[PDB]
Amino acid sequence: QYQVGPLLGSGGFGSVYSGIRVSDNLPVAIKHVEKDRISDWGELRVPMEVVLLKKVSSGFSGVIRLLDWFERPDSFVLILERPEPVQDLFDFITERGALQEELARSFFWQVLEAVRHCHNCGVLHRDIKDENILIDLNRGELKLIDFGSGALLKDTVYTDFDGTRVYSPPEWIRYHRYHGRSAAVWSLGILLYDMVCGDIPFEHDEEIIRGQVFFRQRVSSECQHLIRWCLALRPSDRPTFEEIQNHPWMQDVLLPQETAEIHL
Ligand SMILES: COc1ccc2c(c1CN1CCNCC1)O/C(=C\c1n[nH]c3ccccc13)C2=O
């Protein structure tokens, strides 16, 4: 039913391959998830990732859609949308360096819309970062991938975390506790810094806990202010998604197709 192409990436979780749906030639990604490396299971018994993707794969959005899934004795196999041509945001930033603010604004806006969609669907991603964002290069559209560390959104504290440390908030580093929305906004602050500076702002636990943001590239005062707000040490000091999107730096965003024409 699927023609398997080259390996795209792998880890302890499993492995992801480029692929083609035989019936209509649709480009897909084929993600193999090892049963013994799934720490969080859900019910419809499946990986939480399948639960989460089904909850958000309803309709159009800036989330990669789950097309089908299969169970094997030792693994699940997930069939996911694959834009072509595509580049992840990490590779994009590696190649082009720090992004022009106009471009970072368009990208960051689309990520915000995607994350709002997840939260509105009861889903918390928990690993928002450049590597988990795909750019549909023809359309200038961004897509969130990899819900393998995610969880149902709740209003009470989380005490588990298996996303990316350097994108994790100081409350996690110190007390191994965080709330969903405010932890997400922290990771968004790390992401926006990464876009406009070309690298993440903190490498060690001590820098995260200190929370002093040093800008290594020229960044406008308005952008710096948004970033520093997202990276407030006190979780409750961080902006809501609404406050982020109403921030003066976020005004007059380019459309995705204009973004493609101008920058891609
Ligand atoms: C270590 O590599 C991983 C790990 C988890 C996932 C994954 C990959 C492959 N690459 C790794 C580098 N950044 C982009 C994704 O791709 C996923 C989903 C995809 N859905 N559609 C795609 C289309 C192209 C590439 C990846 C995907 C994952 O969940």
What does this structure look like?
This protein is an alpha+beta fold. The chain folds into two domains: 1-84, Phosphorylase Kinase, domain 1 (2-Layer Sandwich), CATH 3.30.200; 85-264, Transferase(Phosphotransferase), domain 1 (Orthogonal Bundle). Helices cover 34% and strands 22% of the residues. The chain has nine helices and twelve strands. The chain has helices at 48-56, 89-96, 101-120, 170-175, 180-197, 205-210, 221-230, 241-245, 256-263, and strands at 2-11, 14-21, 27-34, 41-42, 46-47, 66-71, 75-81, 86-88, 123-124, 133-136, 141-144, 151-152. A hairpin with a 3-residue loop joins strand 6 (66-71) and strand 7. The structure holds the ligand COc1ccc2c(c1CN1CCNCC1)O/C(=C\c1n[nH]c3ccccc13)C2=O. Ligand 596 binds at residues 8-11, 16, 29, 31, 64, 80-82, 86, 88, 131, 134, 145-146. It is classed as transferase/inhibitor. The entry lists the keywords PIM1, kinase inhibitor, rational drug design, leukemia, TRANSFERASE-INHIBITOR complex. The assembly is monomeric. Crystal structure of Pim1 kinase in complex with inhibitor (Z)-2-[(1H-indazol-3-yl)methylene]-6-methoxy-7-(piperazin-1-ylmethyl)benzofuran-3(2H)-one.
How many DSSP E strands?
12
Our measurement of the CA-to-CA distance between the termini, rounded to an integer number of angstroms, reads 34 Å
CATH fold-level assignment of the largest domain: Transferase(Phosphotransferase), domain 1
Quickly count the helices. 9
Shape call: globular
The structural class is alpha+beta
Name the hetero compounds present. Answer: ligand 596
Cross-sheet strand order for the largest sheet: 1-2-3-7-6
The CATH homology group name of the largest domain? Transferase(Phosphotransferase) domain 1
Q: What's the main sheet like?
A: 5 strands, antiparallel
Alpha carbon gyration radius: 18 Å
CATH uppermost class of the largest domain? Mainly Alpha
CATH architecture of the largest domain: Orthogonal Bundle
Modified residues (Phosphoserine): 58, 221
GO molecular function: ATP binding; manganese ion binding; protein serine kinase activity; protein serine/threonine kinase activator activity; protein serine/threonine kinase activity; ribosomal small subunit binding; transcription factor binding
Catalytic activity: L-seryl-[protein] + ATP = O-phospho-L-seryl-[protein] + ADP + H(+); L-threonyl-[protein] + ATP = O-phospho-L-threonyl-[protein] + ADP + H(+)
Active site: 127 (proton acceptor)
